[PDB]
C-alpha cells in the first residue's frame, strides 16, 4: 500500500464515511479495527454517497492484534506505525513519511488506549499542532491533515497531474 | 488575521461546525458569505458542541462584494486570495502562504461561481491533488488540509509547543 490508514474502534458514522472517500481519492488503504460504534451496512454506505469500489477493499480486523498480525507488524513495537495523540511529541509534519506507512487513529470520544500508545516510541506518536486551550478536532479532518501531509512528502504519487 | 478562511454560501451544517472548530483551534479568522444553506442559531451551535468563543467572532458578509469591501480587497483581482477549485493549477501545497492570506471555498454541491474564479489569476486557484476519477472531498476535510498546509508553511505560529 502507498499509505495505510487505520481507525481503531471508530464511533461516529459520518467520520468514517468521509475517511472512506478520502482514502479512495488519495489511493490509501483503509483498515477498520472492530468494534465499530455504528452499524456497518453496504446500503447505508451507498446512501451516504459512496460507490462500491470506495469501500469494497477496506481491510477489517477483529481486534488490534489481528491488525498487527495481518500486516506482519511487531507487537512489542510496530515499525512505521504512527499514532495520532494529543500527547505525542513530533508534529505530524515533523515525521518523514514513507510508502506503506501506517497511520493509526483512535476513537472520537477516547483516543487510543494506553496499552497501544505506551508500546510505541515517542517519535511514533504524532500530534496535530493546535493553539493553547483547544478542543477536539473532528476525526475525519484530522485524518485528512495527516494523510495529505504524508502524501505531500511523498510527492503525491498517483495524483492526476 | 493569521489566516482568513472564507466560506461562500456553505450548504451543509456539520461542515461549517467542523470548520468553526478548526479555525478556533488554529487561530484563523472565519468569514461566512450568505446565503447559508442551513439555519444559523447560537443554540444549534452550542448543541453541536461549540463554545461561544469559537463562533462569536465569525465575520458575516451579506454577499461576495461585501466581503471584498470589508477586507479592502480589489474586486478586479483580490490580492492574496486563493480559491479552492478542482480546476485550479497549483496544488494547495505549491503556493507559498503568508500571514493574513485569504482562503476561499465554495459550496459543497457547486464550488465557486465563474464570476469569482474567472477574475483570479491561475496561480491563485488552488487544487487539492487527487487520483484520477476521484469524487468530491468533504468540504471541512478540504479546508482542514489547506489550513494546516498554510499553517505548516508559516511555522505554526501560535501553536502550543
Domains and CATH numbers, chain A: 1-161 (3.40.1280.10)
Name every residue whose Cβ is closer than 8 Å to that of residue B16 and which is 6 or more positions away in sequence: B7, B10, B32, B36, B38, B140
B48: contact with A, CB 8 A cutoff: no
- 8 Å CB contact between A30 and A59: yes
Cβ <8 Å between A22 and B149: no
- 8 Å CB contact between B113 and B133: no
Please give the DSSP secondary-structure letter assigned to residue B141. Answer: H
Q: Tell me the torsion sign for CA atoms A26, A32, A36, A42.
A: positive
Cβ <8 Å between B129 and A151: yes
A57: contact with B, CB 8 A cutoff: no
Rounded CA separation B137/A32 (Å) = 20
Residue A102 φ then ψ, to 5°: -105, 130
**Cell numbers for B97:** 502562504
| Alpha-helix runs per DSSP H in A79-138 | 114-117
Distance between start and end Cα atoms, chain A: 20
Residue A35: is the preceding peptide bond cis (ω within 30°)? yes
Cα–Cα distances (Å) from A55 to A26, B19, B102, B147, in that order, read 13, 26, 35, 27
Cβ <8 Å between A159 and B130: yes
Q: How open is the CA angle A70-A50-B18, to the nearest 5 degrees?
A: 90
Burial class (CB in 10 A: 0-12, 13-18, 19+), B137: buried
B140: contact with A, CB 8 A cutoff: yes
* Other CB atoms within 10 Å distance of the CB of residue A29: 17
**Which residues pair with residue B101 across a beta bridge?**
B3
Determine the residue among B138, B143, B155 to mutate to test chain A binding: the one whose Cβ has the most chain A Cβ atoms within 10 Å: B138
Please give the DSSP secondary-structure letter assigned to residue A28. Answer: P
Q: Confirm or deny that B128 is annotated as ligand binding.
A: yes
Distance between start and end Cα atoms, chain B: 20
Q: Hunting for cell 478540504 — which residue is that?
A: B142
Q: How far is A128 from chain B (nearest CA, A)?
A: 9
B26: contact with A, CB 8 A cutoff: yes
Cα–Cα distances (Å) from B95 to B83, B89, B90, B123, in that order, read 12, 10, 7, 8
Q: Give the three-class secondary structure for A11.
A: coil
Cβ <8 Å between B131 and A21: no
- 8 Å CB contact between B4 and B104: no
Residue B64 is inside which H or E element, if any?
helix B64-70
If we measure between CA atoms, which residue out of A10, A139, A152, A4 comes closest to residue A80?
Answer: A4
Residue B129 is inside which H or E element, if any?
none
Nearest CB to A141; choose among B22, B54, B129: B22
> What technique determined this structure?
X-ray
Name every residue whose Cβ is closer than 8 Å to that of residue A160 and which is 6 or more positions away in sequence: B129, B130, B131, B132, B134
Q: Give the three-class secondary structure for B156.
A: coil
- 8 Å CB contact between B93 and B149: yes
A53: contact with B, CB 8 A cutoff: no
Q: What is the resolution of this structure in A?
A: 1.5
Edge-to-edge strand order for the sheet containing B101-105? B59-61, B29-33, B3-8, B101-105, B81-84, B125-126
Cα–Cα distances (Å) from A75 to A61, A71, B103, in that order, read 15, 11, 43
Q: CB-hemisphere CA count at 13 Å for B6? A: 27
B128: contact with A, CB 8 A cutoff: yes
Residue B9 φ then ψ, to 5°: 45, 50
Q: How far is B59 from chain A (nearest CA, A)?
A: 20
Q: Hunting for cell 490580492 — which residue is that?
A: B79
Q: Hunting for cell 500527547 — which residue is that?
A: A87
If we measure between CA atoms, which residue out of B52, B57, B63, B1 comes closest to residue B27?
Answer: B1
Name every residue whose Cβ is closer than 8 Å to that of residue A76 and which is 6 or more positions away in sequence: A119
Rounded CA separation A61/A35 (Å) = 9
Amino acid at each position: 500500500a502507498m499509505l495505510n490508514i487505520v481507525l481503531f474502534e471508530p464511533e461516529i458514522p459520518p467520520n468514517t464515511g468521509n475517511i472512506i472517500r478520502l482514502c479512495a481519492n488519495t489511493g490509501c488503504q483503509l483498515h477498520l479495527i472492530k468494534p465499530l460504534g455504528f452499524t456497518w451496512d453496504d446500503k447505508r454506505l451507498r446512501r451516504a454517497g459512496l460507490d462500491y469500489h470506495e469501500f469494497a477493499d477496506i481491510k477489517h480486523h477483529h481486534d488490534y492484534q489481528a491488525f498487527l498480525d495481518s500486516e506482519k507488524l511487531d507487537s512489542t513495537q510496530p515499525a512505521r506505525l504512527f499514532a495520532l495523540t494529543t500527547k505525542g511529541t513530533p508534529a505530524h509534519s515533523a515525521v518523514s513519511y514513507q510508502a506503506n506507512d501506517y497511520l493509526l487513529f483512535g476513537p472520537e470520544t477516547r483516543g487510543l488506549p494506553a496499552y497501544i500508545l505506551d508500546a510505541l516510541p515517542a517519535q511514533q506518536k504524532i500530534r496535530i499542532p493546535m493553539q493553547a486551550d483547544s478542543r477536539s478536532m473532528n476525526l475525519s479532518n484530522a485524518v485528512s491533515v495527516v494523510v495529505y501531509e504524508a502524501w505531500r512528502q511523498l510527492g503525491y504519487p498517483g495524483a492526476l497531474l
